[PDB]
């Protein structure tokens, strides 16, 4: 009667967070608590904490906090966990486990599991080294890596653009190569794919005065390409 149904398997890029499922069943849902247990490959279990569906009140063990984050709903019987900032350590098999008071606080009945696997020199050149341009023209920037961004599994190119302004912090513009970051003009428009990517200014303003880095984005490895300089003339 009793039943723990845990969400499917999760196979994930590092740095990401997922978030899985247990719906319980054949027991009122508020009057167990909900517990979490990790379990590396080949290793031990190991405790991460609870859930009381009742007050939604929650116990971690110290080790996971600000990694699992515990949550339930009592309207579909239902307890969550999330992971952030997945690395390579978070890779195990997660059970979602009834506690019971009347068995000694032990765990009653658990779930199936769900499996959370977290798996996946180089030379940035960049182009015109600089160039100066009459305001409103058009500028068009170069950048090529030695070797393929583009990532065929999420199909998404991990390039990035920064602007930076004299004696200023660098600014991130574009991200996955044609994604515009919030509070950056529509004029700035990045694009290309595999190993040639280009950053374009629809019509270039006085403020455009900056020096712009391409980066090949990739946790693990970062790489700046050398920069294009940008001075704006009269007209």
């Known amino acids: 009667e009793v039943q723990l149904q845990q969400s499917g398997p999760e196979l994930v890029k590092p740095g990401a967070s997922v978030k899985m499922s247990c719906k319980a069943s054949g027991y009122t849902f508020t009057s167990y608590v909900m517990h979490w247990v990790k379990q590396k490959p080949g290793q031990g279990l190991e405790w991460i904490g609870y859930?009381?569906?009742?007050?939604?009140?929650?116990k971690y063990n110290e080790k996971f906090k600000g990694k699992a984050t515990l949550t339930s709903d009592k309207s579909s019987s239902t307890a969550y966990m999330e992971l952030s900032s997945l690395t390579s350590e978070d890779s195990a098999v997660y059970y979602c486990?009834?506690?019971?008071?009347?068995?000694?606080?032990?765990?009653?009945?658990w779930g199936q599991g769900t499996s959370v696997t977290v798996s996946s020199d180089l030379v940035m050149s960049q182009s015109p080294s600089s160039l100066a341009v009459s305001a409103g023209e058009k500028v068009t920037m170069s950048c090529k890596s030695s070797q393929s961004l583009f990532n065929s599994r999420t199909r998404k190119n991990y390039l990035a653009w920064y602007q930076q302004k004299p004696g200023q912090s660098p600014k991130l513009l574009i991200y996955w190569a044609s994604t515009r970051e919030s509070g950056v003009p529509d004029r700035f428009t990045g694009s290309g794919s595999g190993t040639d990517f280009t950053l374009t200014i629809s019509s270039v303003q006085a403020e455009d005065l900056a020096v712009y880095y391409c980066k090949q984005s990739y946790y693990h490895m970062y790489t700046f390409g050398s920069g294009t300089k940008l001075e704006i003339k009269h007209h």
């Open positions: 859930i009381n569906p009742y007050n939604d009140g929650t």
């Open positions: 486990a009834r506690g019971a008071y009347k068995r000694g606080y032990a765990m009653d009945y």
